[PDB]
């Protein structure tokens, strides 16, 4: 059995608290993307938007690598939560009581050390709905994601276009697009800049 | 297979061959791996060779890499170790140990306690 | 006592992170089935369906085997959560806030290494209810289940017919049938196909 | 100090995953009983009944025994959850989202190895309420309890009469009785029969 | 550093499952008291009372003691949950779904081995509200606390007067007093008597 | 790799239960501050205020220090919950059922041993709303934070001005200011004074 | 039973039989298993034989499989080890160890510290 | 009591009595138990006798059960070991070890490192 | 301080004094404690003396309590051990070991591996 | 790289230089660190020198700090140890051990079992 040998070899000397970088003097690049599937509800009185979304995070470990010729039949491995390093990506404008509303799943790694992480969830965010132009109006709701404890010089966050291939049309609202933008801000807490990624919903009310 | 016992030791002359047999009893022999260790008169126990539970993986030491061989036989519940071109420094006690669904590696933490082995001596 | 000996022998060298396959080059076959017991509620305003369901997963381990003649009186063992490998079957179209709403129970294994897993739960899923034909209409609600991190070439998912022997008739809706279908899809995240199983509810409103 | 010595001696070689039987070829006998304290609510629209109930489970371990003469002053011990074997008794017709709604407490054992377990809880179950005879009618609500993974030949479940000594009368419903019955059923999942215990509420509406 | 030495010395040979008594043949005395801060809500339809309360439990360990002269600068220590023995005091007439609604905090111990435990919480209990004398009426709501697994001969529970110094007056109800009483009862489950402490709210409706 | 070496060196002999002080005879100074981002809701009937807030706690460890010249490329480390000492700051006037409603995140430490902790959350607190001057009125809601088990002589709590740079204006209420004040009180439980920090909201209703 | 003490050693001639008795004290003898170990003059401790707490399971070594036997007696709180056809290599110190509700296996992690044993010597 | 030191050794004749004293320092003597161990010239360390922190529980070996006795004295922070009818095999080094709130058992995992002991020799 | 090296050994006469120096390198010397151990020719390693990272706590053995002393010097990153009135039984190899933020206790689990020590011999 | 084997030993005269080669096989040599240990005739195993998996970190003992050097070669999957100005006390058996993504430190818990080493002897 080669899977047992591979797992035992990989687990050796691994520390989940260490950022999987090879130089320690350069930031680790992480690619972030979104996949919306359904706008479950749009609350006007409470200014809350509910949607079903899958997150997509991609990076490289450099510590989980092996030669496939020495472990025939093994090309990918999966690790549960709390056993390998994972980015702490959070939604800034969260309206849920728990704040974080993501279901943790396994992380998949291939021979080259490339790690992918796609947690599904139902996210509630605070959005401002304008009803001045009731019959005809376009609403813009923003979702802001970013690392909470990792800033610049440590984690370089890059954006990828959102996927709407599996989107399920809503009976009362029509989606126009989900543009994304990457920004970098300064906070009074620290002098280190922090990047973030913001996506726009761009909903439109149906006149019926 | 739960309880492994080694046999086949004796006195041989330098440059000869020897075949040792480790027989299993007390369980299913196909669910365990077999590992060989040498005790030596005044030295510590050292790994020699190992084979996985399915026979698809094998491991050997560095001073035994080219002269020894290991094979399985589920019909007789027996593992066979063939030693060729014996040398004076190979005189020691050989013991056989099981490992449930082992990978045939040199790690000592996946094996159970070795049994009573067989003494072999090589005369120049 | 033979139960202690059997448990101690089985636990040796076992790794929950390893797929219990004997070749590593062939997929592990898992049989999946459903057992509905009651349609607790059908929400039209929120487009949500609530039901009581038992899942059924069957597979083989090849690592949990013993000769019954050497352990007289012992023919089955039970393992709690987190101590043996288990499929990560999830409902894609989940509407619950927790996403996963299954109560974890023990896994039962017999001498041959066959593992069964039947978690009960109350599942909430998003369904579209059409009220155009209010007095007379048939509603189709789909429940989609699949592995989240295990795709083709690793886990071969097979379907079994749903059981409705213990179904409790509802006072407002009548069940017509629960057909099931197995499909295979491609996702933009990975080039490996992923199978899934979809069941249909086929409810009908009672004219009273 | 004798309590430390007794605990240390008892903990040796104990495995929580092993059924505390002395032969392994005979079922372990478990006595089950209920204690209702208050019918907090009766929901007609949702067909749900809420009550406050204490469960009572009694059995024998055969592994937790000692001579009181060698440990003077010690006659009982208490073990928390997850450290000793416990029956997996569950309510089949549960309506709560969590399914299981029991608060885990300590298990008390005396010198002879007799274990008692009395978890309190607030249980929600699905009941059918008939309002055809609105002013005068008797409602029968059934609560079904049973082992989920332990069937016949392993766990012999016996019933004991319910206790209503501490019952608090309700201002709108009157209790007539709580009869209990033990039954044995066959399920398509396995060929091994499974026992269960069912209790009836027998409520009556007050005419005011 | 003396704090590290003190902690390391104290942790040795300590067993959280052992009652911290010096004789094993005498009950351990525990003092219990309450501190109400606000009557957040009084529900008449559901017969539920919500309040903010701090519990106060005081006892002695006899295992956590040291000479302050050998550890200069150290006079108190704090232990988290699950690392030292704690009484299992619970509210019998609980209406919350979780049953237990107390936030676990640290336990403080001084040189003599005296342990104090003051958990805050928001408690929901079932109370009967009589509206026959609507404009003028006094409502009595009882809160009953007691040990669940420790009875007489093991834990001697004593009562202390409730503290209302920090009480915040309510805009619709006026508090008259919170008398307390200690009682001892027998239950059909066991022949060992169990003590309990009951407090009364004594609310009055404001005529406006 | 220097990050692994630094983590392994730091973890040695560390005890999370010890207050990271160098003398044991002087209090540890902790700076506390608040950052409000949005007044999500103001409930008048239930006397509850909901807001989105980030807490800011700053202190020094004296046990997590290293020479940056011996670990080139490493200038900061991050520790998860439960692995290092953290202040037990809680909100006294909490109205949430869980009482504590803070999402735990990592703690960041730089070469000098300075630790920062900024948990985000949605806090519910009990506030009194006066509607006598309905069209025109200013409401004062107080939020009180303090250590629960650490009093004077152990933890010296200092206050810092609140940050409102990222505040999002509300459509129905206008913020005037968030003054803060540090106080010290005595409780009947202990003779040791306890400090606390109170912030005021100072909301005003918009006349539209 | 908490504290086990072995006795019955002595000097015997090759080919004779010997009966060793391990007596229990300090607890209930029916709640523990009994295991036998040999120390040997210059070698390490080695398992010899073991019996479960109920007497339904027994285990023996490989060089002792056919010549030794083990029995229980709860009335006298005594375990008996019968050795037949003794050989010169059986001269060593025999020690008796308890195991709470043991399965009578060779694993050393389920036993407690052995007591003071009895010396036996076999003369050719 | 944190740091225990044994004394009272010497040369005695077979059949005589001897009293050894273990004095405590560095902490509260009433919060710890006292255990005695023998080193022997060429053998391993072995338990001899032990007393609980309150003096209500005592434990002895099997070859010392009837000849030795153990007592406490909190006034002088001293544990006393009385040996009667000494035998030639009792010549060894005796060491004293503490145990915080110990139960006076033979388990070695509840004791701390032993200190520098006292040598005693018995002449036939 | 990460890597500690001891020096100052030599040959001395009974009743004389000796000063041993343990120098630190590879890290901050003020973040670690220093402990001294003796190897002895045919005995096991034994603790001798220890000092906390701040110098406010010290610990000594029982046979060295009154004759030895320990001091720190952060300027030179050196710990000094002064031995007075040496005795013939003090001839051994002395080794120096670090402990990160240690309390200067005798516990061996809070120290790191000792380095190469210095041999000292006392002649009567 | 999974399996490391050392070679290059022999007999040399005091004051000469020697080059030892540790070759890797069974895996990727760039994913592991290399550590050197000395066995000595009658002493215990001791660390000598170590190099990280990337070659950016090195560690040496105190008696070898100035005379030995360590280098890597991924092309030949070989680590080289150069010893200059050999001394009589350097006669021992040198063994090579791997460490997956090691930091090149002296800690023994991050290394795997050493292989069969090479004997080197220095004559005055
Ligand atoms: C493991 O996966 C990675 C990434 O999928 C493969 O490396 C390349 O990664 C970039 C993005 O970082 C892709 O655009 C390339 O297509 C990837 N190369 C491919 C797919 O050949 C890496 O090759 C994979 N390792 C394997 C297949 O053994
Ligand atoms: C353990 O259970 C398995 C499966 O129930 C038995 O193997 C066969 O499995 C197939 C399905 O994979 C069934 O259709 C067969 O009926 C099973 N054989 C039977 C029931 O004889 C296996 O035999 C069982 N092991 C036992 C009973 O020892
Ligand atoms: C420990 O408790 C058990 C059960 O309470 C006692 O054994 C008997 O158990 C049956 C039910 O299984 C009761 O009807 C008997 O009354 C019990 N015997 C009694 C109460 O004497 C057992 O005796 C108890 N052990 C003690 C008291 O040491
Ligand atoms: C530790 O606290 C206890 C209790 O507070 C002190 O012992 C006495 O306890 C009783 C109640 O059990 C109080 O009424 C006394 O006032 C306490 N004695 C005092 C306060 O002197 C004990 O003295 C405290 N230990 C100290 C201060 O070292
Ligand atoms: C680590 O951070 C601390 C605090 O940020 C720096 O020490 C000083 O801390 C005070 C507040 O306690 C600040 O007002 C000073 O500005 C800080 N000094 C600076 C920023 O130079 C400490 O210098 C930092 N360590 C580094 C940068 O290596
Ligand atoms: C790490 O990055 C720095 C600059 O960011 C560079 O100078 C250095 O060479 C890099 N490390 C290595 C091993 O090349
Ligand atoms: C993997 O191993 C094979 C067999 O030794 C070898 O030919 C190949 O080069 C190795 N792969 C890499 C990337 O070194
Ligand atoms: C594993 O499967 C492959 C093809 O899927 C096959 O060639 C190989 O023989 C199988 N393994 C064994 C041990 O037969
Ligand atoms: C189980 O053990 C018995 C007894 O040795 C044997 O006859 C039988 O063949 C074994 N079963 C298998 C499948 O080998
Ligand atoms: C276990 O039960 C079987 C029948 O159920 C019986 O034949 C056997 O004797 C029992 N075990 C013992 C040790 O008596
Ligand atoms: C318990 O111990 C006492 C004292 O040795 C003994 O008399 C009694 O018989 C024992 N109890 C049992 C059930 O053996
Ligand atoms: C324990 O209490 C009993 C009576 O409750 C008493 O006889 C006994 O003496 C007490 N223990 C001690 C050590 O005094
Ligand atoms: C604490 O230690 C000091 C110093 O040895 C001593 O004087 C005092 O009596 C001790 N306290 C107690 C309660 O024994
Ligand atoms: C600790 O503080 C006290 C007074 O608070 C002071 O006397 C003492 O010197 C301080 N400790 C040190 C090591 O200076
Ligand atoms: C850090 O190390 C460098 C190099 O040895 C040294 O020059 C510097 O003084 C050190 N820093 C401190 C604060 O001692
Ligand atoms: C960038 N983060 C998001 C807001 C707070 C800030 C932060 C900074 C340092 C540690 N934790 C959080
Ligand atoms: C097939 N899965 C279901 C949707 C996401 C996808 C996936 C792929 C790889 C890792 N995790 C999830
Ligand atoms: C008897 N149980 C109740 C319903 C499912 C069934 C069962 C059978 C085997 C394993 N788990 C559950
Ligand atoms: C006194 N307790 C409160 C009600 C149940 C009873 C009890 C008795 C024994 C074990 N657990 C609970
Ligand atoms: C100061 N705290 C806040 C209220 C209770 C008090 C307290 C005192 C001691 C231990 N825990 C809590």
Short mmCIF file of N, CA and C in Angstrom, two decimals, chain J residues 76-121:
data_model
loop_
_atom_site.label_atom_id
_atom_site.label_comp_id
_atom_site.label_asym_id
_atom_site.label_seq_id
_atom_site.Cartn_x
_atom_site.Cartn_y
_atom_site.Cartn_z
N UNK J 76 24.68 14.81 -7.80
CA UNK J 76 25.05 13.44 -7.45
C UNK J 76 24.28 12.90 -6.26
N UNK J 77 23.33 13.66 -5.71
CA UNK J 77 22.57 13.24 -4.54
C UNK J 77 23.51 12.82 -3.41
N UNK J 78 24.46 13.70 -3.10
CA UNK J 78 25.52 13.38 -2.16
C UNK J 78 25.83 14.56 -1.25
N UNK J 79 25.97 14.28 0.04
CA UNK J 79 26.47 15.24 1.01
C UNK J 79 27.91 14.90 1.35
N UNK J 80 28.75 15.92 1.45
CA UNK J 80 30.18 15.74 1.68
C UNK J 80 30.56 16.35 3.02
N UNK J 81 31.31 15.59 3.81
CA UNK J 81 31.85 16.05 5.09
C UNK J 81 33.36 16.05 5.00
N UNK J 82 33.97 17.22 5.15
CA UNK J 82 35.42 17.37 5.09
C UNK J 82 35.95 17.60 6.50
N UNK J 83 36.90 16.76 6.91
CA UNK J 83 37.52 16.84 8.22
C UNK J 83 38.99 17.17 8.04
N UNK J 84 39.46 18.22 8.71
CA UNK J 84 40.84 18.66 8.61
C UNK J 84 41.50 18.60 9.98
N UNK J 85 42.80 18.30 9.98
CA UNK J 85 43.58 18.22 11.21
C UNK J 85 42.95 17.23 12.19
N UNK J 86 42.88 15.98 11.76
CA UNK J 86 42.28 14.94 12.57
C UNK J 86 43.10 14.70 13.84
N UNK J 87 42.42 14.25 14.88
CA UNK J 87 43.01 14.02 16.19
C UNK J 87 42.70 12.60 16.65
N UNK J 88 43.48 12.07 17.58
CA UNK J 88 43.28 10.67 18.00
C UNK J 88 41.89 10.39 18.54
N UNK J 89 41.23 11.38 19.14
CA UNK J 89 39.91 11.17 19.73
C UNK J 89 38.79 11.18 18.69
N UNK J 90 39.12 11.33 17.41
CA UNK J 90 38.12 11.32 16.35
C UNK J 90 37.89 9.93 15.76
N UNK J 91 38.55 8.90 16.29
CA UNK J 91 38.37 7.54 15.80
C UNK J 91 37.03 7.01 16.29
N UNK J 92 36.13 6.72 15.35
CA UNK J 92 34.79 6.24 15.69
C UNK J 92 34.09 5.83 14.40
N UNK J 93 32.81 5.46 14.53
CA UNK J 93 31.96 5.11 13.40
C UNK J 93 31.04 6.29 13.11
N UNK J 94 31.07 6.77 11.87
CA UNK J 94 30.27 7.90 11.43
C UNK J 94 29.07 7.41 10.64
N UNK J 95 27.88 7.91 10.99
CA UNK J 95 26.63 7.52 10.35
C UNK J 95 25.90 8.76 9.86
N UNK J 96 25.13 8.57 8.79
CA UNK J 96 24.43 9.65 8.10
C UNK J 96 22.93 9.40 8.20
N UNK J 97 22.17 10.45 8.55
CA UNK J 97 20.74 10.31 8.74
C UNK J 97 19.98 11.40 8.00
N UNK J 98 18.80 11.09 7.47
CA UNK J 98 17.99 12.10 6.77
C UNK J 98 16.97 12.76 7.68
N UNK J 99 16.48 13.91 7.21
CA UNK J 99 15.41 14.64 7.90
C UNK J 99 14.61 15.40 6.85
N UNK J 100 13.31 15.11 6.76
CA UNK J 100 12.47 15.72 5.74
C UNK J 100 12.31 17.21 6.02
N UNK J 101 12.78 18.04 5.08
CA UNK J 101 12.68 19.49 5.20
C UNK J 101 13.19 19.96 6.56
N UNK J 102 14.32 19.41 6.99
CA UNK J 102 14.89 19.79 8.26
C UNK J 102 15.54 21.16 8.22
N UNK J 103 15.72 21.73 9.41
CA UNK J 103 16.33 23.04 9.56
C UNK J 103 17.83 22.96 9.83
N UNK J 104 18.42 21.77 9.79
CA UNK J 104 19.83 21.62 10.08
C UNK J 104 20.19 21.92 11.52
N UNK J 105 19.39 21.46 12.46
CA UNK J 105 19.63 21.67 13.88
C UNK J 105 20.14 20.39 14.53
N UNK J 106 20.49 20.50 15.81
CA UNK J 106 21.02 19.37 16.56
C UNK J 106 19.94 18.51 17.20
N UNK J 107 18.68 18.93 17.13
CA UNK J 107 17.60 18.14 17.72
C UNK J 107 17.53 16.77 17.08
N UNK J 108 17.42 15.73 17.91
CA UNK J 108 17.39 14.36 17.44
C UNK J 108 15.99 13.86 17.12
N UNK J 109 14.95 14.63 17.44
CA UNK J 109 13.58 14.18 17.23
C UNK J 109 13.08 14.44 15.82
N UNK J 110 13.82 15.19 15.00
CA UNK J 110 13.41 15.48 13.63
C UNK J 110 14.17 14.65 12.61
N UNK J 111 14.96 13.67 13.05
CA UNK J 111 15.71 12.80 12.16
C UNK J 111 15.13 11.39 12.19
N UNK J 112 15.49 10.61 11.18
CA UNK J 112 15.10 9.22 11.09
C UNK J 112 16.25 8.33 11.55
N UNK J 113 16.01 7.02 11.55
CA UNK J 113 17.02 6.08 11.99
C UNK J 113 18.24 6.14 11.08
N UNK J 114 19.42 6.18 11.70
CA UNK J 114 20.66 6.19 10.94
C UNK J 114 20.91 4.82 10.31
N UNK J 115 21.65 4.82 9.22
CA UNK J 115 22.01 3.60 8.53
C UNK J 115 23.30 3.01 9.04
N UNK J 116 23.87 2.11 8.24
CA UNK J 116 25.15 1.49 8.56
C UNK J 116 26.27 2.44 8.16
N UNK J 117 27.09 2.81 9.13
CA UNK J 117 28.08 3.85 8.95
C UNK J 117 29.43 3.32 8.50
N UNK J 118 30.42 4.21 8.55
CA UNK J 118 31.79 3.88 8.17
C UNK J 118 32.72 4.11 9.35
N UNK J 119 33.63 3.16 9.58
CA UNK J 119 34.60 3.24 10.66
C UNK J 119 35.82 4.03 10.21
N UNK J 120 36.27 4.97 11.05
CA UNK J 120 37.48 5.74 10.80
C UNK J 120 38.34 5.68 12.05
N UNK J 121 39.65 5.50 11.86
CA UNK J 121 40.60 5.39 12.95
C UNK J 121 41.77 6.33 12.70
#
